[PDB]
Write a protein that binds this ligand. Structure first.
Ligand code: HEM
Length: 153
């Protein structure tokens, strides 16, 4: 679905993310909450964080961003061959957290924004197109798994 060149652009910028997983995850979650505040409702503890500085100071949020980006990176590195990595994520996000696909679109937008903000020289139009294809594939495949579990979000 992605070409080998597209996967290489995805993994090239992902290596830059991995130089500071925690900082990238903080910026991505903070961007998600500021652009789409309704998403913050899904987090029992984090939803009580009232300012950007509190969000940046939160060890809980920082640890969570690392968990999120580690899971996403493990999926991306499979270059589409991600059933085993995607299934447990679909299970929890469909049946426990109840995260609609539109919220995965919102976080994909935040990922793109932060990648471009931090790595513009390694995240031009072709690299952005490749990352958008990879995240579109992630969202398509997770939506199919959602439906297999009975969730139409
Ligand atoms: C790139 C997309 C995402 C990835 C890779 C991801 C990954 C994860 C991982 C690995 C966990 C911990 C294990 C688990 O419960 O499955 C998790 C927990 C969670 N995620 Fe996601 N996540 C995604 C997007 C979202 C979005 C968009 C929301 C809400 C808008 C969300 C809210 C949840 C919540 C509420 C928890 C439980 C947090 C807790 O109580 O400790 N996630 N996520």
């Amino acid at each position: 679905v992605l070409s080998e060149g597209e996967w290489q652009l995805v993994l090239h910028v992902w290596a830059k993310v991995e130089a500071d997983v925690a900082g990238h995850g903080q910026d991505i979650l903070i961007r998600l909450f500021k652009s789409h505040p309704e998403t913050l409702e899904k987090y029992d503890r984090s939803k009580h964080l009232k300012t950007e500085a509190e969000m940046k100071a939160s060890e809980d949020l920082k640890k969570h961003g690392v968990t999120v980006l580690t899971a996403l990176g493990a999926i991306l590195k499979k270059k589409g061959h991600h059933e085993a990595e995607l299934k447990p994520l679909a299970q929890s996000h469909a049946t426990k957290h109840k995260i609609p696909i539109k919220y995965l679109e919102f976080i994909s937008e935040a990922i793109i924004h932060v990648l471009h903000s931090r790595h513009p020289g390694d995240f031009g139009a072709d690299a952005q197109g490749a990352m958008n294809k990879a995240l579109e594939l992630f969202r398509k495949d997770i939506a199919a798994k959602y439906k297999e579990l009975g969730y139409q979000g």
